[PDB]
Design goal:
- The structure is cut from a larger assembly and holds chains A, B and C.
- By secondary structure, chain A is an alpha/beta fold.
- Chain A has helices spanning 16-27, 47-59, 72-81, 89-95, 129-136; strands at residues 7-10, 33-36, 42-44, 98-100, 126-128.
- Chain A has a three-stranded parallel β-sheet. A two-stranded antiparallel ribbon of chain A has the order 3-5.
- In chain A, helix 1 (16-27) packs across helix 3.
- The two termini of chain A are 18 Å apart.
- By secondary structure, chain B is α+β, with helices and mostly antiparallel strands.
- Chain B has one domain (1-150): Ribosomal Protein L22, Chain A (Alpha-Beta Complex).
- In chain B, strand 5 (125-127) and strand 6 form a beta hairpin.
- Chain B is globular, with a radius of gyration of 17 Å.
- In chain B, 31% of the residues are buried.
- By secondary structure, chain C is an alpha+beta fold.
- Chain C has one domain.
- Chain C has two helices and four strands; from the N terminus they run βαββαβ.
- Chain C has helices spanning 17-29, 117-129, and strands spanning 3-5, 89-93, 107-111, 139-141.
- The chains hardly touch.
- The complex binds chloride ion (CL) (7 copies), magnesium ion (11 copies), sodium ion (9 copies) and strontium ion (10 copies).
- One chloride ion is lined by residues 61, 65-66 of chain A.
- Chain C binds two RNA strands through helix 1 and helix 2.
- It is classed as ribosome.
- Keywords: large ribosomal subunit, antibiotic specificity, Ribonucleoprotein, RNA-binding, ribosome.
- Co-crystal structure of Homoharringtonine bound to the large ribosomal subunit.
RNA sequence: ACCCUCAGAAGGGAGGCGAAAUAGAGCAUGAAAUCAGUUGGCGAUCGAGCGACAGGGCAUACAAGGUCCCUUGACGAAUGACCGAGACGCGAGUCUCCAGUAAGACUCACGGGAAGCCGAUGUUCUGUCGUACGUUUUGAAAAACGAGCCAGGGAGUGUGUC
RNA sequence: CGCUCUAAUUGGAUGGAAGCAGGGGCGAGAGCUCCUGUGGACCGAUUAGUGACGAAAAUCCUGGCCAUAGUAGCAGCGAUA
């Protein structure tokens, strides 16, 4: 379905938390943001420990529940929510005006935000969001 | 007792009241609530269907433990309070009777206002175990009715 | 055909530059409600002020948000304290002989509630003739 | 009283008396807790000392309050620039001049505007702060003690001596 | 600051007192005061007195009232009617 975005961000080879922090800041300023190519988004560090943290979040829960997303679609969306006061009116409106996508459903190419890009030629210790999702058990639909 | 809580123009209106009725007040709120807006004749047919058990009265406020009824629309709980329905029929017999005497078409008149008020309790006492006694009271109900021309 | 008030209703006093400055200050600054602690929490506890005596009382200890405690620092300016919002000093009147000595430029008059329609009519006409405004006038059909 | 209704000396309706029946029989007045109906505000995706202070929505017969908004201008405490020019710094940036200038809370004046309009009141939304009250206690939101709610009642008094 | 009754001085009320309900104004505040409705006969102020004079609390007292709830009971017994 259509979503009229003011800003379209390209998450490809970009440090997740840094994109997320900027997308949150913009959503609270009234912008309708759309994060694109989230499967190709990046997160630094040793893969074994990163996956361990995300696997623990999946195993955590009870009857009240702890719904933790396995797909890179929802993982990026949850990362943004943690940077937004989603329980408050202004915060929920900001969050609901942000959507994360697998690939690029638009004709326009996304913009790469400043300070978010990771130089692959300078880094080897990082993981792609899709690689985390495959290890978590999600169905590769990208 | 009570007095009519709503203004009424005598030229286009018929009135009626019930005094110190020993019936359930909780049932009376539910019946009043449901018959309001209906025509006097529609209300008589409705209350007769309740006594027969063919039409349930929605219990929206006093419903703790009340089982669900399929015929209740927009709500779930309901019952068939015959005692208070028979008393409301006496109120509608009086109202339509007062109406016809004034030259109106009683049955066809709209129920503009209908409300039940708890006027008191007929005190009672029930012996319990351990040499103690507790209350066993009967509610005393008043109910006003204002019929109006369509 | 319509209702009209007796006397000089639209009359305003002549105050010095300083007394008008202080009157405008009292009106701007205002003061807090000064209602008793937790009056809103319990019906048996009225709005009337009582000093919070409790050793652990949040209001007594001056916790922010628990309401202002009565202090002398809250007093209105001496030069304007007790004046009617118009700027007039009030004089309570019971009869016609109570209007004597009243300066209609500085003071306005307030007829006591008990005083009946007969005596009120005589007080009102004698007040208008003496150039004194009646704060609580009779509204006659003119 | 009369009439209608009703199983009816009930009750109800209409009617009569009286200044007043909302003075109609435990019948002067008629508070609160609280109940029925109803009005305003909120409301079935959202968080809990229930508020105080700020600021917005919606709501308001009169009376007892009459203020309030916007251009501009005057005054102008502490504070206090942009731009530009000159000069330093690896750099972020800084010093000098412009300048204690423009600005600067309050208050006032001219012109224009508002009367649900300003205040105020009801409710609700946003911001800030906020785990009752009283008592016990070194330490009470306390998993320490008391209260279901309201009204009324409820605790330094007398004599003698010093 | 407020309450009771006494006194002196001095006022208000059937052209509507006290009380009560809702509302306006003042006082840092105790509280004062006005408007409207109700009520239908009493009510103040100042000064000097008087005191069975002020409540949110005491598992406080008495009365009234809500939720609990249209819920438990109206079955169980060698007499199942
Ligand atoms: Cl779970
Ligand atoms: Cl939040
Ligand atoms: Cl690396
Ligand atoms: Cl009941
Ligand atoms: Cl003082
Ligand atoms: Cl000023
Ligand atoms: Cl003492
Ligand atoms: Mg049941
Ligand atoms: Mg016994
Ligand atoms: Mg209260
Ligand atoms: Mg009475
Ligand atoms: Mg201890
Ligand atoms: Mg005197
Ligand atoms: Mg008392
Ligand atoms: Mg105490
Ligand atoms: Mg008791
Ligand atoms: Mg139960
Ligand atoms: Mg048998
Ligand atoms: Na990490
Ligand atoms: Na989980
Ligand atoms: Na149904
Ligand atoms: Na249905
Ligand atoms: Na408001
Ligand atoms: Na204690
Ligand atoms: Na405590
Ligand atoms: Na505790
Ligand atoms: Na009880
Ligand atoms: Sr940012
Ligand atoms: Sr219920
Ligand atoms: Sr009066
Ligand atoms: Sr009558
Ligand atoms: Sr929380
Ligand atoms: Sr200056
Ligand atoms: Sr009432
Ligand atoms: Sr006492
Ligand atoms: Sr009960
Ligand atoms: Sr049996």
């Amino acid at each position: 379905a259509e979503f009229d975005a003011d800003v379209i961000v390209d998450a490809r080879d970009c440090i997740m938390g840094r994109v997320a922090s900027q997308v949150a800041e913009q959503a609270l300023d009234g912008e309708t943001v759309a994060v694109v190519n989230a499967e190709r988004a990046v997160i630094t560090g040793r893969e074994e420990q990163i996956v361990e943290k995300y696997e623990k979040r999946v195993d955590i829960g009870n009857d009240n529940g702890y719904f933790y997303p396995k797909r890179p679609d929802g993982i990026f969306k949850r990362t943004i929510r943690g940077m937004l006061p989603h329980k408050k009116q202004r915060g929920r409106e900001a969050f609901e005006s942000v959507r994360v996508y697998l690939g690029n459903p638009y004709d326009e190419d996304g913009e790469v935000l400043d300070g978010t890009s990771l130089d692959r030629l300078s880094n080897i210790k990082f993981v792609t969001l899709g690689e985390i999702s495959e290890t978590l058990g999600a169905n590769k639909t990208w | 007792g009570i007095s009519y809580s709503v203004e009424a123009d005598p030229d286009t209106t018929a009135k009626a009241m019930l005094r110190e009725r020993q019936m359930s007040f909780k049932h009376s709120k539910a019946i009043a609530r449901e018959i309001k807006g209906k025509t006097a004749g529609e209300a008589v047919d409705y209350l007769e269907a309740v006594i027969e058990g063919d039409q349930p009265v929605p219990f929206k406020q006093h419903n703790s433990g009340v089982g669900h009824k399929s015929k209740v629309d927009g709500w779930d709980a309901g019952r068939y309070p015959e005692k208070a329905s028979k008393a409301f029929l006496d109120l509608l017999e009086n109202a339509v009777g007062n109406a016809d005497h004034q030259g109106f078409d009683g049955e066809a008149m709209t129920i503009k206002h209908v409300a039940a008020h708890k006027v008191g309790e007929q005190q009672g006492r029930k012996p319990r175990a351990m040499g103690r006694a507790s209350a066993w009271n009967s509610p005393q109900v008043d109910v006003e009715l204002i019929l109006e021309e369509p | 055909t319509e209702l009209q008030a007796r006397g000089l209703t639209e009359k305003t006093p002549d105050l010095s530059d300083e007394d008008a400055r202080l009157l405008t200050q009292r009106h701007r600054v205002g003061k807090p409600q000064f209602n008793r602690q937790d009056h809103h929490k319990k019906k048996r506890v009225s709005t009337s002020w009582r000093k919070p005596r409790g050793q652990l009382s949040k209001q007594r200890r001056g916790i922010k948000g628990k309401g202002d405690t009565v202090e002398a620092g809250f007093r209105s300016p001496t030069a304007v304290r007790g004046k009617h919002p118009s700027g007039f000093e009030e004089v309570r009147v019971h009869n016609v002989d109570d209007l004597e000595g009243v300066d209609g430029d500085t003071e306005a008059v307030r007829i006591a509630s008990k005083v009946g329609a007969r005596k009120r009519e005589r007080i009102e006409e004698e007040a208008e003739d003496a150039g004194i405004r009646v704060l609580n006038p009779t509204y006659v059909e003119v």
